[PDB]
Amino acid sequence: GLVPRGSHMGLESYAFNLKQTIEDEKLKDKISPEDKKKIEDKCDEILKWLDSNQTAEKEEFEHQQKDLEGLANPIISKLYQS
């Protein structure tokens, strides 16, 4: 073990959604295009990895997650200034 699919969809999904969110007309403008790029770049990256991999041993699949969590959460925290 060696990640099973669930987790694989889970990351793809997170990654995917951060993206949607960042480019959602209703939010698009409340996020500095620096942070916007940073998110787009980590997301795009991870998705590519996920794509090449759909399994690779977890003890690091996590690295790839936490890497992106580390970016997003702080950014999108500030973002929920609705």
How far apart are the C-alpha atoms of 80 and 71, rounded to whole Å? 15
How far apart are the C-alpha atoms of 33 and 79, rounded to whole Å? 12
Domain that holds residue 5: 1-82
Q: Are 15 and 46 in contact (CB under 8 A)?
A: yes
The neighbour count for residue 2, using CB atoms within 10 Å, is: 9
In CATH, what number is assigned to the domain containing residue 34?
Answer: 1.20.1270.10
Closest listed residue to residue 79, CA positions, set 71, 42, 15, 41: 71
How far apart are the C-alpha atoms of 36 and 46, rounded to whole Å? 16
Which 8-state DSSP code applies to residue 21?
H
Q: How many domains does the chain have?
A: 1
